[PDB]
Design a binder for this molecule. Structure first.
Ligand code: CHL
Ligand code: CLA
Ligand code: CLA
Ligand code: CLA
Ligand code: CLA
Ligand code: CLA
Ligand code: CLA
Ligand code: CLA
Ligand code: XAT
Ligand code: XAT
Lengths: 196, 41, 152, 201
């Protein structure tokens, strides 16, 4: 579709049949079709996780302007005491995520092989694409048209860049992502990466 | 000149330019941060 | 105290070495007028020596009985900056160089006279290939999985 | 083939056939023997001309008005030492971003001509110029003088080039005069006009 850089030609292997195809591959990673098949799923999962991560790192700090709750910052949330030890929670998380991610992985190898429930055999996911399971994962039956997929990919890429910015700013400034915005909005020409 | 550009791509001249730039970079790096025995970061 | 060693900051021999070096530097300065350039150079040398000794004291090195720092390479987390991190950086850089060389060699293998492209380098193609080695681990690992790394 | 030459009686180089605006056959070292180098050098000369004309105006018109006392601006040499509303590095970064967007589209038109002639936001808007380095359209030619017969064009494009070269020489002269004599360029002119025989290097 669109060109990431006018005046340059698109790669041959990027034919525009994929969602969010702007012909961006200067370093040629996806020349091998198997690499492309793996990297599509990698991008999807990374974007979907980063969107939730950013949403959870930003909004629980926006409370200061509205003053509903009192929650520690995203980099101090770990040290707080909880009803269970950190090791127990980590063990349970590992136990569940092992099964979940092994179930997801088998679809990439042999599509359509894990669409059936293992305990209640009368239940099965409708046939779909590799990275878009559907079924009970889509309770509202929204149509997965190409426009919605492109919107999803754009939001995922933006959120990934936002998470990288959130990580890098804290190492330098030492404050929260929202506090960095208000300081910039106070004196825009004096509060940038160039401190002076 | 095409022939002049060809002579600049021969192995000895290119190697000399590359190694001169490399040595300059290393000398400046050791000038800014002298006596490095450990990676402290 | 690994292997019976002691921290540099508590070592008396380290301080004695510093004092001897500084005293040796100071005896040469008495031969010159304070305003002269050699006096300035000797002052800079003395300051640099003091700074180097202070920095070695700060980083948590270990000294022996001779007052000289020793390196631990067994993998202990308290000394990862001595061997592990520079090793990983060197491995990354060497893999970059090797991958770029292999890519350039493969690129010109299909030409009519591949030998002439080795004595007279094709600058634009190499420049285009130079940037690609920045992600060499991913490309190398995926090539290993696909079986294209080893010649048949 | 019968155009005036820089060195009358000599023979112009083979690659300089008189087709370009401002061509006098001056290329002793053969820096543009091949066509690609010729095109690149033509574009570099046109850009250097346009920046040097802006720079010459900005150096000399302000300094003259200060001397006759109408304005009170500082010297052009030390104009980068005054304190503005923000630190200089921030201004440099803003400059870099804006001029990078401006020049980046100019790079793509050199490599692939006529690929960047459309407005990315409002496709109703276009540039009209056919020739690389002469973009035209309502942005760069609002009066419509930049198109016409080949006679009308080869004059205007030669006038631009001859003025730009003079401006480049004048700018370098002003730099070296301020380096050596240590005084503004206008003072040098008045000193020369006072005692032309002796007010010299
Ligand atoms: C992704 C991810 C990143 C970048 C971090 C990064 C961090 N965690 Mg952390 N964690 C992450 C996932 C998780 N953490 C934790 C549990 C903890 C705890 C208990 C602690 C951290 C702490 C820290 C900080 C260590 C300095 C740092 C901000 C420490 C901290 O917050 O100190 C300021 C800390 O005590 N994390 C769990 C549950 C097992 C995670 C999933
Ligand atoms: C993804 C993701 C992850 C890993 C987390 C993880 C966490 N959130 Mg959280 N959150 C997310 C998305 C996410 N959130 C989104 C999308 C919203 C909206 C919130 C709104 C939210 C609130 C309002 C609070 C948390 C809190 C917490 C922490 C303790 C609660 C818990 O997990 O038990 C924990 C570190 C709690 C916290 O930090 O204090 C205990 C808390 O009060 N989250
Ligand atoms: C959507 C992405 C995004 C957005 C909106 C911002 C926004 C902001 N960043 Mg930022 N940042 C980002 C990505 C982003 N960043 C990334 C990816 C990095 C890592 C390279 C950083 C590293 C960074 C630092 C180190 C600092 C900021 C700071 C700031 C604030 C002042 C603006 C400034 O100096 O710009 C700086 C712009 C950059 C460093 C370039 C980032 C690349 C651009 C933004 C990509 C998006 C287009 C501003 C709120 C400053 C701050 O805290 O202000 C008080 C500051 O000191 N950012
Ligand atoms: C005597 C004056 C003088 C001064 C002040 C400098 C200062 C500098 N030189 Mg340098 N240089 C000089 C004379 C001087 N040079 C001479 C006479 C030569 C031989 C022709 C060189 C050859 C040289 C090389 C080959 C390189 C430097 C580099 C550098 C920079 C190193 C810092 C860096 O890498 O950060 C990054 C750079 C900057 C922050 C600004 C540049 C630094 C700004 C290095 C450099 O620029 O690194 C990119 C580098 O590779 N210099
Ligand atoms: C494989 C052999 C080897 C290894 C691992 C090293 C490793 C090192 N050398 Mg080195 N060196 C070597 C051979 C080697 N050298 C040889 C053969 C010579 C003679 C040409 C030198 C001459 C040399 C000098 C002159 C200096 C180093 C320095 C250093 C340190 C570099 C500090 C930095 O940031 O860069 C590092 C520990 C620098 C240092 O300060 O070390 C503490 C330094 O100034 N080396
Ligand atoms: C970037 C630093 C800088 C600064 C501080 C100034 C400052 C100034 N310029 Mg100026 N100028 C600059 C760069 C700069 N210029 C460049 C790069 C060019 C090209 C010009 C071309 C230029 C012209 C053509 C004129 C000015 C004029 C002026 C003065 C009137 C300001 C208003 O309008 C002011 C002192 C005007 C003036 O009368 O100068 C006193 C004027 O006519 N400038
Ligand atoms: C002696 C000074 C001089 C002269 C005679 C010209 C003459 C010309 N310029 Mg021009 N130009 C100059 C200085 C000059 N320029 C400087 C200093 C700049 C940099 C600010 C430019 C930037 C510039 C652009 C960007 C464009 C021209 C264009 C043109 C041509 C049509 C515009 C015109 O005159 O109609 C008035 C309207 C015309 C041959 C245009 C052209 O050739 O395209 C048709 C065009 O697009 N010029
Ligand atoms: C457009 C070009 C140009 C012009 C008009 C001038 C004009 C002037 N320069 Mg000058 N200069 C120039 C370029 C120019 N310079 C360059 C490029 C340099 C760097 C080498 C210098 C270095 C320089 C110094 C060091 C000094 C002057 C001085 C002077 C003034 C006294 C005359 C003199 O002794 O200069 C001699 C001129 C030169 C050595 C440069 C040669 C002239 C160039 C090649 C252009 C030739 C003009 C052109 C071919 C004729 C037609 C165009 C005409 C309408 C201008 C005079 C106003 C003196 C001063 O301050 O006045 C009191 C002085 O001390 N200039
Ligand atoms: C998933 C992700 C992050 C997820 C974060 C999560 C969940 C965070 C959770 C937490 O916060 C909460 C919620 C609770 C907080 O208290 C605590 C923690 C737990 C910390 C990031 C991905 C992040 C991914 C990023 C940044 C990727 C960047 C990749 C780029 C730029 C690639 C560029 C190229 O790829 C192309 C396009 C083509 C190549 O050819 C050319 C190049 C140039 C090489
Ligand atoms: C290129 C140049 C010189 C050219 C050299 C020549 C003739 C070479 C000619 C030859 O190659 C040929 C043709 C053919 C070959 O066979 C032989 C040689 C002999 C090799 C000069 C200037 C080149 C470039 C110039 C003039 C740059 C301009 C600078 C500007 C715009 C400055 C602006 C400002 O001054 C303001 C306005 C206000 C201030 O406050 C701030 C600043 C920023 C300082």
């Amino acid at each position: 579709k669109g060109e990431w850089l006018p005046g340059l030609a698109s790669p041959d292997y990027l034919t525009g049949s994929l969602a969010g195809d702007n012909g961006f591959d200067p370093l040629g990673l996806a020349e091998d079709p198997e690499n492309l098949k793996w990297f599509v799923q990698a991008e999807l999962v990374n974007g979907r996780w980063a969107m939730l991560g950013v949403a959870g790192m930003l909004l629980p700090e926006v409370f200061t302007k509205i003053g509903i709750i009192n929650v520690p910052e995203w980099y101090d949330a770990g040290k707080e005491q909880y009803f269970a030890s950190s090791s127990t929670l980590f063990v349970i998380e590992f136990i569940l995520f092992h099964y979940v991610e092994i179930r997801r992985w088998q679809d990439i190898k042999n599509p359509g092989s894990v669409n059936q429930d293992p305990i209640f055999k009368q239940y099965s996911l409708p046939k779909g694409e590799v990275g878009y399971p559907g079924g009970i994962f889509n309770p509202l039956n929204f149509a997965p048209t190409q426009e919605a997929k492109e919107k999803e990919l754009a939001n995922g890429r933006l959120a990934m860049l936002a998470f990288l910015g959130f990580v890098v700013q804290h190492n330098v400034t030492g404050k929260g992502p929202f506090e960095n915005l208000l300081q910039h909005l106070s004196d825009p020409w004096h509060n940038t990466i160039v401190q002076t | 000149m095409r022939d002049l550009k060809t002579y600049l791509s021969v192995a000895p001249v290119l190697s000399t330019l590359w190694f001169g730039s490399l040595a300059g970079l290393l000398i400046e790096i050791n000038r800014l941060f002298p006596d490095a025995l450990t990676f402290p970061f | 105290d690994i292997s019976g060693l002691t921290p540099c900051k508590d070592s008396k021999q380290f301080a004695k070495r510093e004092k001897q070096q500084i005293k040796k530097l100071e005896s040469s300065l008495k031969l010159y007028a304070p305003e002269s350039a050699p006096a300035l150079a000797l002052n800079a040398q003395i300051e640099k020596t003091k700074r180097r000794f202070d920095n070695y004291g700060k980083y948590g090195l270990l000294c022996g009985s001779d007052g000289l720092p020793h390196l631990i390479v067994n993998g202990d987390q308290r000394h990862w900056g001595e061997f592990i991190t520079p090793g990983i950086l060197f491995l990354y850089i060497a893999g970059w160089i090797g991958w770029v060389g292999r890519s350039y060699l493969i690129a010109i293998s299909g030409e009519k006279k591949p030998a002439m492209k080795e004595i007279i380098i094709d600058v634009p193609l190499a420049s285009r290939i130079i940037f690609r080695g920045f992600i060499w681990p991913v490309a190398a690992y995926r090539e290993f999985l696909n079986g294209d790394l080893i010649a048949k | 083939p019968d155009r005036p030459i820089w060195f009358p009686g000599s023979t112009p180089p083979e690659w300089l056939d008189g087709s370009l605006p401002g061509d006098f056959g001056f290329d002793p070292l053969g820096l543009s023997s091949d066509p690609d180098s010729l095109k690149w050098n033509v574009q570099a000369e046109i850009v250097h001309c346009r920046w040097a004309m802006l720079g010459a105006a900005g150096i000399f018109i302000p300094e003259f008005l200060t001397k006759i006392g109408i304005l009170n601006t500082p010297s052009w040499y030390t104009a980068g030492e005054q304190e503005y509303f923000t630190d200089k590095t921030t201004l440099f970064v803003v400059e870099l971003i804006l001029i990078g967007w401006a020049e980046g589209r100019r790079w793509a038109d050199i490599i692939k001509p006529g690929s960047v002639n459309t407005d990315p936001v409002f496709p109703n808007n276009k540039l009209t110029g056919t020739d690389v380095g002469y973009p035209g359209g309502l942005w760069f030619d609002p009066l419509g003088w930049g198109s016409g017969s080949p006679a009308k064009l080869k004059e205007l494009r030669t006038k631009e080039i001859k003025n730009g070269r003079l401006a480049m020489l004048a700018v370098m002269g002003a730099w070296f005069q301020h380096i050596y004599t240590g005084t503004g360029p206008i003072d040098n002119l008045f000193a020369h006009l006072a005692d032309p025989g002796h007010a010299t290097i």
